[PDB]
Ligand binder design. Sequence first.
Ligand SMILES: O[C@H]1[C@H](NCc2ccccc2)[C@H]2CO[C@H](O2)[C@@H]1Sc1ccccc1
Length: 330
Amino acid sequence: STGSATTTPIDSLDDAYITPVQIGTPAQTLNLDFDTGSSDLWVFSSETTASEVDGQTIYTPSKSTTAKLLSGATWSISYGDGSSSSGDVYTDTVSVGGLTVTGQAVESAKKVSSSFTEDSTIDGLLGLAFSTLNTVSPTQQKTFFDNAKASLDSPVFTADLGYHAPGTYNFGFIDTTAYTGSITYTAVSTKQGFWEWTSTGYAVGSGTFKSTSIDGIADTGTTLLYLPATVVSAYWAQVSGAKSSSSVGGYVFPCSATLPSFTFGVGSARIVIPGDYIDFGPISTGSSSCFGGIQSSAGIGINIFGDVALKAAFVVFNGATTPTLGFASK
Ligand SMILES: O[C@H]1[C@H](NCc2ccccc2)[C@H]2CO[C@H](O2)[C@@H]1Sc1ccccc1
Protein backbone atom coordinates (compact mmCIF):
# COMPACT_ATOMS: atom_id res chain seq x y z
CA SER A 1 0.00 0.00 0.00
CA THR A 2 0.90 3.68 -0.29
CA GLY A 3 -0.37 7.06 0.84
CA SER A 4 0.11 10.58 -0.47
CA ALA A 5 -1.07 13.83 1.10
CA THR A 6 -0.53 17.52 0.46
CA THR A 7 1.10 19.52 3.25
CA THR A 8 0.46 23.29 3.51
CA PRO A 9 2.23 26.17 5.30
CA ILE A 10 0.04 27.51 8.12
CA ASP A 11 1.10 31.12 7.41
CA SER A 12 3.16 33.34 5.11
CA LEU A 13 6.38 32.60 6.97
CA ASP A 14 6.18 28.80 6.68
CA ASP A 15 6.16 28.63 10.50
CA ALA A 16 4.77 25.11 10.24
CA TYR A 17 2.98 22.76 7.88
CA ILE A 18 -0.41 21.08 8.25
CA THR A 19 -1.59 17.87 6.57
CA PRO A 20 -5.19 16.62 6.51
CA VAL A 21 -5.77 13.38 8.44
CA GLN A 22 -8.96 11.28 8.57
CA ILE A 23 -9.81 9.91 12.00
CA GLY A 24 -12.66 7.65 13.03
CA THR A 25 -15.86 6.35 11.43
CA PRO A 26 -17.34 8.29 9.81
CA ALA A 27 -14.18 10.25 9.06
CA GLN A 28 -13.37 13.34 11.11
CA THR A 29 -10.77 15.33 9.19
CA LEU A 30 -8.20 17.22 11.25
CA ASN A 31 -5.22 19.20 10.02
CA LEU A 32 -2.18 17.86 11.81
CA ASP A 33 1.44 18.99 12.12
CA PHE A 34 3.55 16.01 10.90
CA ASP A 35 6.52 15.98 13.25
CA THR A 36 9.57 13.77 12.63
CA GLY A 37 10.91 15.03 15.96
CA SER A 38 8.29 13.44 18.22
CA SER A 39 6.25 10.25 18.33
CA ASP A 40 2.78 11.05 19.65
CA LEU A 41 -0.35 11.43 17.55
CA TRP A 42 -2.45 13.83 19.60
CA VAL A 43 -5.48 15.93 18.79
CA PHE A 44 -7.73 18.72 19.99
CA SER A 45 -10.93 17.02 21.10
CA SER A 46 -14.36 17.20 22.69
CA GLU A 47 -12.46 16.52 25.94
CA THR A 48 -10.20 19.57 25.68
CA THR A 49 -10.85 22.33 28.23
CA ALA A 50 -13.26 24.70 26.46
CA SER A 51 -11.29 27.84 27.34
CA GLU A 52 -8.26 26.25 25.67
CA VAL A 53 -9.93 25.72 22.31
CA ASP A 54 -9.95 28.70 19.94
CA GLY A 55 -10.73 27.87 16.31
CA GLN A 56 -9.34 24.33 16.12
CA THR A 57 -11.22 21.40 14.63
CA ILE A 58 -11.81 18.79 17.31
CA TYR A 59 -11.94 14.99 17.38
CA THR A 60 -15.11 13.71 19.04
CA PRO A 61 -14.52 10.05 19.89
CA SER A 62 -18.10 9.52 21.09
CA LYS A 63 -19.17 10.08 17.46
CA SER A 64 -16.73 7.53 16.02
CA THR A 65 -18.13 4.00 15.91
CA THR A 66 -14.61 2.59 15.68
CA ALA A 67 -13.19 4.56 18.63
CA LYS A 68 -12.28 2.55 21.75
CA LEU A 69 -11.02 4.09 24.98
CA LEU A 70 -7.63 2.65 25.86
CA SER A 71 -8.24 1.77 29.50
CA GLY A 72 -5.99 3.47 32.03
CA ALA A 73 -3.80 5.10 29.39
CA THR A 74 -2.71 8.74 29.66
CA TRP A 75 -0.21 10.93 27.84
CA SER A 76 1.64 14.15 28.54
CA ILE A 77 4.25 15.88 26.41
CA SER A 78 6.38 19.03 26.41
CA TYR A 79 8.19 20.62 23.47
CA GLY A 80 11.34 22.72 23.20
CA ASP A 81 9.43 26.00 23.13
CA GLY A 82 7.90 25.26 26.52
CA SER A 83 4.56 24.28 25.01
CA SER A 84 2.66 21.26 26.31
CA SER A 85 -0.42 19.08 26.07
CA SER A 86 -1.91 16.05 27.85
CA GLY A 87 -4.95 13.78 28.09
CA ASP A 88 -6.23 10.25 27.52
CA VAL A 89 -6.05 7.73 24.68
CA TYR A 90 -8.38 6.10 22.18
CA THR A 91 -7.63 3.59 19.45
CA ASP A 92 -9.31 4.40 16.14
CA THR A 93 -8.94 4.20 12.37
CA VAL A 94 -6.59 6.80 10.94
CA SER A 95 -5.99 7.52 7.26
CA VAL A 96 -3.42 9.72 5.55
CA GLY A 97 -3.84 10.36 1.84
CA GLY A 98 -5.42 6.97 1.14
CA LEU A 99 -3.25 4.94 3.52
CA THR A 100 -5.22 3.42 6.38
CA VAL A 101 -4.21 2.16 9.84
CA THR A 102 -6.73 0.49 12.12
CA GLY A 103 -6.19 0.49 15.88
CA GLN A 104 -4.00 3.59 15.80
CA ALA A 105 -3.45 5.26 19.18
CA VAL A 106 -5.15 8.66 18.99
CA GLU A 107 -4.20 10.75 21.99
CA SER A 108 -7.09 13.00 22.98
CA ALA A 109 -6.08 16.28 24.63
CA LYS A 110 -7.64 17.30 27.90
CA LYS A 111 -5.19 20.16 28.32
CA VAL A 112 -3.09 22.22 25.91
CA SER A 113 -0.74 25.12 26.58
CA SER A 114 -1.44 28.67 25.43
CA SER A 115 0.71 28.49 22.28
CA PHE A 116 -1.42 25.64 20.94
CA THR A 117 -4.63 27.45 21.85
CA GLU A 118 -3.44 30.61 20.07
CA ASP A 119 -2.70 28.70 16.86
CA SER A 120 -6.10 28.02 15.31
CA THR A 121 -4.59 26.33 12.24
CA ILE A 122 -3.08 23.29 13.96
CA ASP A 123 -5.52 20.64 15.18
CA GLY A 124 -2.81 18.42 16.65
CA LEU A 125 0.41 16.59 15.88
CA LEU A 126 1.27 13.39 14.05
CA GLY A 127 4.63 12.11 15.32
CA LEU A 128 7.03 10.38 12.92
CA ALA A 129 10.14 9.89 15.06
CA PHE A 130 10.82 6.48 16.57
CA SER A 131 8.15 4.90 18.76
CA THR A 132 10.58 4.67 21.68
CA LEU A 133 9.77 8.36 22.34
CA ASN A 134 5.98 7.85 22.61
CA THR A 135 4.72 9.22 25.92
CA VAL A 136 1.65 7.01 26.48
CA SER A 137 1.65 5.47 29.96
CA PRO A 138 1.63 2.82 31.32
CA THR A 139 1.81 1.13 27.90
CA GLN A 140 3.80 2.88 25.15
CA GLN A 141 1.99 3.14 21.80
CA LYS A 142 3.32 3.03 18.22
CA THR A 143 3.48 5.80 15.62
CA PHE A 144 1.31 5.89 12.49
CA PHE A 145 4.35 5.04 10.35
CA ASP A 146 5.39 2.18 12.62
CA ASN A 147 1.87 0.72 12.45
CA ALA A 148 1.68 1.12 8.65
CA LYS A 149 5.26 0.02 7.88
CA ALA A 150 4.76 -3.69 7.17
CA SER A 151 1.87 -2.99 4.80
CA LEU A 152 3.69 -0.34 2.76
CA ASP A 153 5.17 -1.20 -0.63
CA SER A 154 8.46 -0.01 0.85
CA PRO A 155 9.10 0.86 4.53
CA VAL A 156 9.65 4.57 3.85
CA PHE A 157 8.02 7.95 3.96
CA THR A 158 9.22 11.13 2.26
CA ALA A 159 8.97 14.82 3.10
CA ASP A 160 8.75 17.39 0.31
CA LEU A 161 8.06 20.72 2.03
CA GLY A 162 7.41 23.79 -0.09
CA TYR A 163 8.85 27.29 0.25
CA HIS A 164 5.76 29.53 0.52
CA ALA A 165 3.92 26.76 -1.33
CA PRO A 166 2.20 23.39 -0.89
CA GLY A 167 4.23 20.19 -0.69
CA THR A 168 3.77 16.47 -0.16
CA TYR A 169 4.16 13.66 2.37
CA ASN A 170 4.33 10.29 0.67
CA PHE A 171 4.18 6.90 2.37
CA GLY A 172 5.44 3.62 0.95
CA PHE A 173 7.10 4.93 -2.20
CA ILE A 174 9.64 7.32 -3.67
CA ASP A 175 8.39 9.72 -6.34
CA THR A 176 11.38 9.89 -8.68
CA THR A 177 9.87 12.92 -10.45
CA ALA A 178 9.90 15.01 -7.24
CA TYR A 179 13.65 15.72 -7.19
CA THR A 180 16.64 16.38 -9.40
CA GLY A 181 19.89 14.41 -9.52
CA SER A 182 20.29 11.49 -7.12
CA ILE A 183 19.26 10.81 -3.54
CA THR A 184 22.25 10.64 -1.19
CA TYR A 185 21.69 8.34 1.77
CA THR A 186 23.40 8.82 5.09
CA ALA A 187 23.53 6.83 8.33
CA VAL A 188 20.97 7.32 11.10
CA SER A 189 21.36 6.82 14.83
CA THR A 190 18.12 5.99 16.62
CA LYS A 191 19.66 5.98 20.09
CA GLN A 192 17.89 9.19 21.09
CA GLY A 193 14.71 8.22 19.26
CA PHE A 194 15.27 10.77 16.50
CA TRP A 195 16.16 10.69 12.82
CA GLU A 196 19.68 11.64 13.91
CA TRP A 197 22.45 11.96 11.36
CA THR A 198 25.79 13.65 10.71
CA SER A 199 26.17 16.43 8.17
CA THR A 200 29.59 16.63 6.53
CA GLY A 201 29.84 20.42 6.74
CA TYR A 202 28.65 23.72 5.36
CA ALA A 203 29.23 26.77 3.19
CA VAL A 204 27.98 30.34 3.41
CA GLY A 205 26.86 31.86 0.12
CA SER A 206 29.57 31.36 -2.51
CA GLY A 207 32.18 30.73 0.20
CA THR A 208 34.40 27.66 0.38
CA PHE A 209 32.87 24.55 1.89
CA LYS A 210 33.99 23.75 5.43
CA SER A 211 34.35 20.01 6.08
CA THR A 212 33.22 19.40 9.63
CA SER A 213 30.94 16.89 11.35
CA ILE A 214 27.62 18.29 12.48
CA ASP A 215 25.44 15.90 14.42
CA GLY A 216 21.75 16.76 14.25
CA ILE A 217 18.20 15.61 13.70
CA ALA A 218 15.92 15.84 10.67
CA ASP A 219 12.88 17.47 12.24
CA THR A 220 9.85 18.55 10.23
CA GLY A 221 8.23 19.81 13.44
CA THR A 222 10.78 22.56 14.04
CA THR A 223 10.63 25.75 11.99
CA LEU A 224 14.23 26.88 11.94
CA LEU A 225 17.73 25.57 11.33
CA TYR A 226 19.59 25.28 14.64
CA LEU A 227 23.35 24.84 14.31
CA PRO A 228 26.53 25.30 16.40
CA ALA A 229 27.32 28.82 17.54
CA THR A 230 30.52 28.89 15.46
CA VAL A 231 28.62 28.02 12.27
CA VAL A 232 25.78 30.44 12.96
CA SER A 233 28.22 33.27 13.70
CA ALA A 234 30.00 32.58 10.39
CA TYR A 235 26.69 32.82 8.54
CA TRP A 236 25.39 36.08 10.04
CA ALA A 237 28.82 37.68 9.78
CA GLN A 238 28.02 37.80 6.05
CA VAL A 239 24.89 39.92 6.61
CA SER A 240 25.62 43.60 7.16
CA GLY A 241 23.96 44.84 10.34
CA ALA A 242 23.05 41.38 11.60
CA LYS A 243 23.39 40.97 15.37
CA SER A 244 22.48 38.48 18.07
CA SER A 245 19.79 40.04 20.23
CA SER A 246 19.25 38.81 23.78
CA SER A 247 15.92 40.62 24.15
CA VAL A 248 14.57 39.16 20.91
CA GLY A 249 16.20 35.77 21.53
CA GLY A 250 18.54 35.24 18.61
CA TYR A 251 20.00 36.68 15.45
CA VAL A 252 18.13 39.52 13.79
CA PHE A 253 19.02 41.47 10.65
CA PRO A 254 17.93 44.58 8.72
CA CYS A 255 14.89 43.65 6.64
CA SER A 256 16.50 45.47 3.67
CA ALA A 257 19.39 42.98 3.62
CA THR A 258 20.03 40.41 0.92
CA LEU A 259 20.61 37.07 2.65
CA PRO A 260 23.33 34.72 1.40
CA SER A 261 22.46 31.07 0.79
CA PHE A 262 23.47 28.33 3.22
CA THR A 263 24.77 24.97 2.04
CA PHE A 264 24.97 21.81 4.13
CA GLY A 265 26.69 18.54 3.29
CA VAL A 266 25.12 15.12 3.00
CA GLY A 267 28.11 12.89 2.40
CA SER A 268 29.70 14.27 -0.75
CA ALA A 269 26.40 15.84 -1.83
CA ARG A 270 25.36 19.42 -1.14
CA ILE A 271 21.98 20.93 -0.34
CA VAL A 272 21.69 24.68 -0.99
CA ILE A 273 19.21 26.68 1.12
CA PRO A 274 18.38 29.89 -0.79
CA GLY A 275 18.90 33.08 1.18
CA ASP A 276 15.24 34.08 1.28
CA TYR A 277 14.40 30.77 3.07
CA ILE A 278 16.30 32.22 6.02
CA ASP A 279 14.12 35.37 6.29
CA PHE A 280 11.34 35.11 8.90
CA GLY A 281 10.13 38.66 8.64
CA PRO A 282 9.78 41.57 11.06
CA ILE A 283 10.32 40.78 14.73
CA SER A 284 7.12 42.70 15.47
CA THR A 285 4.52 44.14 13.12
CA GLY A 286 5.90 47.18 11.32
CA SER A 287 9.51 46.67 12.44
CA SER A 288 12.43 46.97 10.03
CA SER A 289 14.34 44.41 12.08
CA CYS A 290 13.86 40.86 10.77
CA PHE A 291 14.26 37.50 12.49
CA GLY A 292 16.80 35.00 11.19
CA GLY A 293 16.01 31.46 10.15
CA ILE A 294 19.42 30.11 11.19
CA GLN A 295 19.93 30.19 14.95
CA SER A 296 22.36 28.84 17.53
CA SER A 297 21.69 25.40 19.01
CA ALA A 298 23.88 26.15 22.04
CA GLY A 299 20.96 26.38 24.48
CA ILE A 300 19.19 23.33 23.03
CA GLY A 301 21.76 20.59 23.43
CA ILE A 302 21.22 19.29 19.91
CA ASN A 303 21.44 20.58 16.33
CA ILE A 304 18.16 20.65 14.47
CA PHE A 305 17.71 20.46 10.73
CA GLY A 306 14.22 21.94 10.84
CA ASP A 307 11.96 23.15 8.05
CA VAL A 308 14.37 25.85 6.85
CA ALA A 309 16.79 23.10 5.80
CA LEU A 310 14.38 20.32 4.91
CA LYS A 311 12.25 22.40 2.54
CA ALA A 312 15.34 22.89 0.37
CA ALA A 313 15.44 19.11 -0.18
CA PHE A 314 13.49 16.01 -1.06
CA VAL A 315 13.93 13.95 2.12
CA VAL A 316 13.60 10.18 2.46
CA PHE A 317 12.94 8.73 5.89
CA ASN A 318 13.97 5.11 5.28
CA GLY A 319 12.48 2.87 7.95
CA ALA A 320 14.23 -0.32 6.89
CA THR A 321 15.69 -2.66 9.54
CA THR A 322 18.63 -0.28 9.67
CA PRO A 323 17.08 3.11 9.08
CA THR A 324 18.80 5.76 6.95
CA LEU A 325 18.03 9.26 5.65
CA GLY A 326 18.12 10.34 2.03
CA PHE A 327 18.54 13.90 0.68
CA ALA A 328 18.13 15.14 -2.86
CA SER A 329 18.10 18.58 -4.41
CA LYS A 330 14.85 19.58 -6.10
O1 LIG B 1 10.10 25.17 16.01
C1 LIG B 1 9.64 24.95 17.34
C2 LIG B 1 8.26 24.19 17.18
N1 LIG B 1 7.17 25.19 16.93
C3 LIG B 1 7.04 25.61 15.50
C4 LIG B 1 5.88 26.54 15.26
C5 LIG B 1 6.04 27.91 15.33
C6 LIG B 1 4.97 28.76 15.09
C7 LIG B 1 3.73 28.25 14.78
C8 LIG B 1 3.56 26.88 14.71
C9 LIG B 1 4.63 26.03 14.95
C10 LIG B 1 7.95 23.40 18.47
C11 LIG B 1 8.51 21.98 18.45
O2 LIG B 1 9.78 22.08 19.11
C12 LIG B 1 9.98 23.44 19.38
O3 LIG B 1 8.70 23.99 19.56
C13 LIG B 1 10.63 24.07 18.11
S1 LIG B 1 12.14 25.03 18.51
C14 LIG B 1 13.03 23.94 19.59
C15 LIG B 1 13.60 24.45 20.75
C16 LIG B 1 14.26 23.60 21.62
C17 LIG B 1 14.35 22.25 21.35
C18 LIG B 1 13.79 21.74 20.20
C19 LIG B 1 13.14 22.58 19.31
